[PDB]
Amino acid sequence: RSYPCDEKKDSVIAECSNRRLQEVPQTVGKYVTELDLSDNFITHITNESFQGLQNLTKINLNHNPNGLNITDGAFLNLKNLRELLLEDNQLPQIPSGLPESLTELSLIQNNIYNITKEGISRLINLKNLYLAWNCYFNKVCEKTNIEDGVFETLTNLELLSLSFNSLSHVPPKLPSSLRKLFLSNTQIKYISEEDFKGLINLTLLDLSGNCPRCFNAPFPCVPCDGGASINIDRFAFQNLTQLRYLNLSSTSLRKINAAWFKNMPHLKVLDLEFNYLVGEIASGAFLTMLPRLEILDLSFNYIKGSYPQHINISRNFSKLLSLRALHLRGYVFQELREDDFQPLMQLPNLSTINLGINFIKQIDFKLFQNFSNLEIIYLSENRISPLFEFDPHSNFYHFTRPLIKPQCAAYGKALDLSLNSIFFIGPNQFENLPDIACLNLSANSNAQVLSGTEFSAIPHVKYLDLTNNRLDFDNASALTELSDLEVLDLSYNSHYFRIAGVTHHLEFIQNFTNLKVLNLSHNNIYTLTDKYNLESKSLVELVFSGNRLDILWNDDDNRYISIFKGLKNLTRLDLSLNRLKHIPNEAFLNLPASLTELHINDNMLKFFNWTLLQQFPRLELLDLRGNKLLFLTDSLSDFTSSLRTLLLSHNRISHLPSGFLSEVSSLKHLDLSSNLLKTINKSALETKTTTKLSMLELHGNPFECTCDIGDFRRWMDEHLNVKIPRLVDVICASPGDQRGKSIVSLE
């Protein structure tokens, strides 16, 4: 059994991160090819640290300690080492004598202010070199000294990242093999004709944050003198014929020289966020030079103090023939009229329009159907009413997550109106809209009684998100006009459910023939009017977490005893966070017999009647984590033959009964972590048929490490197929001499 790392298997990885290791372990497997030692307390690396580990092709030593002192030539003997990650290590210099076999070296987030030939010129096989985030913002640091011609001999270098360093000028003598050059936030004020002359294979250039736009910056921002623009020579990109990505975000540009794109026939992504381009958006000659551009980001170009009535889009936007996505967040305007987006309406592949954060008060929604083929209409965070801190591996100027949840967008045309003020959906709200399949009305402070007519203009919505509103469910016909509804999210609409004296109606759930997923989470549901039961012939998943089944299933009330029984097709049920101390036997028996997955985690269960699992012949996963269960049944095989996963972590199990792990043949994963187990007896492990378990979790139990743990230690040796992860965390609580150590220590 591997210790202290966990080994996963054209390679074998030793997962050894975040285990409080004070030194590199001298017990790593001879066959290991990738060693992850990140987030440990290692303070020193010497030529003896990785001795006899010649198969290593990758080492990750990021975030060590919690600076790391690496001796000259510490990694020199590792002849197949290709990838070395040494991020966030407070390194004062590039380590000396690094192995010549390196193809990837990451030194992000260190204190390296000198890039010398001694450090990297001998690394002739380098393909990717990351030196970003060594001197930036108000960090006490020196200006970066790039030794003349340091990168020149790295003739296989394809990616060079020097962003978030004080460079002042583009380094001369860069190798012509470069494909991606990152120079964001480097204090480069001028780009000359010769700065990139030999870079004929360059596909990406990032010059963002040079002469930044600093008003309301969420980081320490130093603008160029007088808030001046970056000065790019007319011929600076004349030989960058292969450029596909260009990032000029936050370069304080007011004018874009169209000639910059004269010899960029393949430009695909142009990022111009955080500039002063309102004038250029209205009359952009550069827009005629970009017929293959697919993504154009012009977000946050607003004029401080100016809140115009309308957006002014140049007729030249009609020349962006290949445009697929247009981002115009933070332009800031009051109304979107149909005439305002006429230049975009004949672009055949424009599928995404992003107008988030524009303080838009009104939109003529009929304009969207006149676009060729919109698939994502993102209008989140507007004022529409009734009709280290930064991840160095992420985009600094915008979030990279999808605008709309992929599960919602997969259904078809999406309209996101979340975080607006549509407090009431009137009869004309969704008129003249395309066939919307995915609709998000989350966080619109909507307190209306939906009554079956509000969505009649878009009746083919398949995924509806109404979360975080104050909806008053007081009409049995609510949402029934949505005949094709498959996913309905009503999470966080507790406002009226929490008032006992008002009426509450959930009868509409029964009317849907295609409803698959329903989320009623965090609604504080504890009382219903007249109809106490949820019914659906189609529903497969119900999320009922954050409600009050402790009240609904109170021992003195029989009204909700069959609340979920009518969900005849249900396979997944989540009853977590319902303050349950016990479930009445009759209420558990009335859960749908079709269940395959049942979660009752994060309640306060003191008892669980295991005998009742007999009535659930399809139950594969039972999750009882985060409860107060004191014991386990000694005859689980008599009550279930389908259970494959049993999650019991964070409970108070102090003893396993005799014959527990052996008899349940279908059980593959048993999680007993964070319980109160002191020991595991020989009787508890084996009986007649050996264990069909493949994973047994035991970290966080207060084990007694005396000779009484010997039987379990021998069982672990005889059952190497049963994985017990994180042995470093399966720790001795007693006696004093063994406290803090893993149970696998002491013979």
Ligand X SMILES: *[C@@H]1O[C@H](CO)[C@@H](O[C@@H]2O[C@H](CO)[C@@H](O[C@@H]3O[C@H](CO)[C@@H](O)[C@H](O)[C@@H]3O)[C@H](O)[C@H]2NC(C)=O)[C@H](O)[C@H]1NC(C)=O
Ligand Y SMILES: CCC[C@@H](CCO)Nc1nc(N)nc2cnn(Cc3cc(CN[C@@H]4COC[C@H]4O)ccc3OC)c12
Ligand Z SMILES: *[C@@H]1O[C@H](CO)[C@@H](O)[C@H](O)[C@H]1NC(C)=O
Nearest to 58 by CA among 1, 22, 103: 103
Residue 185 beta carbon to ligand X: minimum distance, rounded to whole angstroms:
23
Residue 332 makes contact with ligand Y by CB under 6 A: yes
CB within 8 Å of 9: residues ≥ 6 apart: none
CB within 8 Å of 268: residues ≥ 6 apart: 244, 245, 292, 293, 294, 295
Do the beta carbons of residue 281 and residue 312 sit within 8 Å? Answer: yes
Which of ligand Z, its own copies, ligand X, none does residue 382 bind to, with CB < 5 to 8 Å depending on kind?
none
CA–CA separation, 52 vs 48, rounded Å? 9
Q: Which letter, b or e, does each residue of 154-177 get, where b requires 16 or more Cβ atoms within 10 Å of its Cβ?
A: beebbbbbbbbbbbeebbeebbee
Exactly one of 387, 457, 621, 733 binds its own copies (CB under 8 A); which one? 733
**Angle subtended at Cα 395 by Cα 233 and Cα 161, rounded to the nearest 5 degrees:** 60
Residue 465 makes contact with ligand X by CB under 6 A: yes
Residue 54 makes contact with ligand Z by CB under 6 A: yes
- Residue 671 pairs in a beta bridge with 647, 697
CA–CA separation, 35 vs 53, rounded Å? 10
Residue 554 makes contact with its own copies by CB under 8 A: yes
Residue 609 beta carbon to ligand Z: minimum distance, rounded to whole angstroms:
4
Residue 154 beta carbon to ligand Z: minimum distance, rounded to whole angstroms:
11
CA–CA separation, 312 vs 323, rounded Å? 18
Cα-based distances in Å from 396 to 40, 163, 391, 596: 27, 11, 8, 43
Which of its own copies, ligand Y, ligand X, none does residue 418 bind to, with CB < 5 to 8 Å depending on kind?
ligand X
Do the beta carbons of residue 302 and residue 332 sit within 8 Å? Answer: yes
- DSSP 3-state percent helix, strand, coil across the chain (nearest 5): 15, 15, 75
Residue 717 makes contact with its own copies by CB under 8 A: no
CA–CA separation, 281 vs 274, rounded Å? 13
Residue 558 makes contact with ligand X by CB under 6 A: no
CB within 8 Å of 30: residues ≥ 6 apart: 52, 53, 55
Residue 551 beta carbon to its own copies: minimum distance, rounded to whole angstroms:
6
Q: Indicate the length of the chain as a whole number.
A: 747
CA–CA separation, 643 vs 648, rounded Å? 13
Which of ligand Y, ligand Z, ligand X, none does residue 306 bind to, with CB < 5 to 8 Å depending on kind?
ligand Y
Please compute, for residue 164, the number of CA atoms within 13 A of its CA located in the half-sphere on the CB side: 23
- Kindly tell me which of 446 and 627 has the beta carbon lying closer to ligand Y: 446
Cα-based distances in Å from 489 to 441, 485, 564, 568: 10, 11, 18, 20
Which of its own copies, ligand Y, ligand Z, none does residue 307 bind to, with CB < 5 to 8 Å depending on kind?
ligand Y
- Kindly tell me which of 189 and 470 has the beta carbon lying closer to ligand Y: 470
Residue 489 makes contact with ligand X by CB under 6 A: yes
Residue 125 makes contact with ligand Z by CB under 6 A: no
Which of its own copies, ligand X, ligand Z, none does residue 517 bind to, with CB < 5 to 8 Å depending on kind?
ligand X
Residue 525 beta carbon to ligand Y: minimum distance, rounded to whole angstroms:
13
- Residue count at the site for ligand Y (CB under 6 A)? 17
Give me 207's structure tokens. 């010059």
Which 440-469 positions form the footprint of ligand Z (CB under 6 A)?
451-452
Nearest to 548 by CA among 519, 589, 579, 588: 579
Residue 718 beta carbon to ligand X: minimum distance, rounded to whole angstroms:
34
Exposed/middle/buried for residue 550 (C-beta within 10 Å: 0-12, 13-18, 19+): middle
Residue 370 makes contact with ligand Z by CB under 6 A: yes
- Segment near ligand Z (CB under 6 A); pick from 473-481, 490-498, 643-651, 686-694: 473-481
Q: List the beta strands (DSSP E) in 443-553.
A: 463-465, 487-489, 517-519, 541-543
Which of ligand Y, ligand X, its own copies, none does residue 722 bind to, with CB < 5 to 8 Å depending on kind?
none
Residue 510 makes contact with ligand Z by CB under 6 A: yes
Could you identify the residue written with the tokens 């930064």? 390
Give me 506's structure tokens. 């959930």
- Kindly tell me which of 449 and 612 has the beta carbon lying closer to its own copies: 449
Exactly one of 309, 500, 688, 717 binds its own copies (CB under 8 A); which one? 500
Residue 521 makes contact with ligand X by CB under 6 A: yes
Exactly one of 357, 404, 605, 613 binds ligand Y (CB under 6 A); which one? 357
CA–CA separation, 196 vs 129, rounded Å? 18
Which of ligand Y, ligand X, its own copies, none does residue 701 bind to, with CB < 5 to 8 Å depending on kind?
none
Exactly one of 2, 18, 57, 69 binds ligand Z (CB under 6 A); which one? 69
Exactly one of 27, 30, 140, 305 binds ligand Y (CB under 6 A); which one? 305
- Segment near ligand Y (CB under 6 A); pick from 32-40, 146-154, 501-509, 548-556: 501-509
Residue 467 makes contact with ligand X by CB under 6 A: yes
**Residue 627 CA, distance from chain mean position:** 28
Exactly one of 349, 503, 554, 596 binds ligand Z (CB under 6 A); which one? 349
- Kindly tell me which of 89 and 576 has the beta carbon lying closer to ligand X: 576
- The residue type at 292: R
CA–CA separation, 14 vs 276, rounded Å? 50
Residue 480 makes contact with ligand Z by CB under 6 A: yes
Which 514-543 positions form the footprint of its own copies (CB under 8 A)?
526-527, 529-530
Residue 487 makes contact with ligand Z by CB under 6 A: no
Do the beta carbons of residue 156 and residue 124 sit within 8 Å? Answer: yes
- Segment near ligand Y (CB under 6 A); pick from 33-41, 305-313, 337-345, 696-704: 305-313
Which of its own copies, ligand X, ligand Z, none does residue 345 bind to, with CB < 5 to 8 Å depending on kind?
ligand Z
Could you identify the residue written with the tokens 């020349």? 319
- Kindly tell me which of 431 and 557 has the beta carbon lying closer to its own copies: 557
Residue 739 makes contact with its own copies by CB under 8 A: yes
Residue-wise DSSP of 227-276: GPPPEE-TTTTTT-TT--EEE-TTS--S---GGGGTT-TT--EEE--SS-
CA–CA separation, 565 vs 533, rounded Å? 8
Cis peptide leading into 4, omega within 30 of 0? yes
Which 374-433 positions form the footprint of ligand X (CB under 6 A)?
380, 401, 404-405, 407-408, 418-419
- The residue type at 88: D
- Kindly tell me which of 105 and 443 has the beta carbon lying closer to its own copies: 443
Residue 557 makes contact with its own copies by CB under 8 A: yes
Exactly one of 288, 445, 477, 687 binds its own copies (CB under 8 A); which one? 445
- Kindly tell me which of 277 and 570 has the beta carbon lying closer to ligand Z: 570
- Kindly tell me which of 500 and 720 has the beta carbon lying closer to its own copies: 500
Residue 249 beta carbon to its own copies: minimum distance, rounded to whole angstroms:
13
Q: Which letter, b or e, does each residue of 87-106 get, where b requires 16 or more Cβ atoms within 10 Å of its Cβ?
A: bbbebebbbebbbeebbbbb
Give me 675's structure tokens. 């319980």
Residue 27 beta carbon to ligand Z: minimum distance, rounded to whole angstroms:
13
Residue 309 makes contact with ligand Y by CB under 6 A: no
Residue 142 makes contact with its own copies by CB under 8 A: no
DSSP structural state of residue 742? B
Can you give the binding site for ligand Z, defined by CB under 6 A?
30-31, 44, 46, 54-55, 69, 176-177, 201, 321-322, 338, 345-346, 348-349, 370, 451-452, 475-477, 480, 510-511, 516, 537-538, 540, 569, 585, 589, 609, 611-612
Can you give the binding site for ligand X, defined by CB under 6 A?
380, 401, 404-405, 407-408, 418-419, 440, 442-443, 465, 467, 487, 489, 491, 517, 519, 521, 541, 543
Can you give the binding site for its own copies, defined by CB under 8 A?
136-139, 215-216, 218-220, 300, 329-330, 357, 381, 383, 388-389, 419, 421, 423, 445, 447, 470, 495, 499-503, 526-527, 529-530, 551, 554-559, 678, 702, 704, 706, 708, 733-736, 739
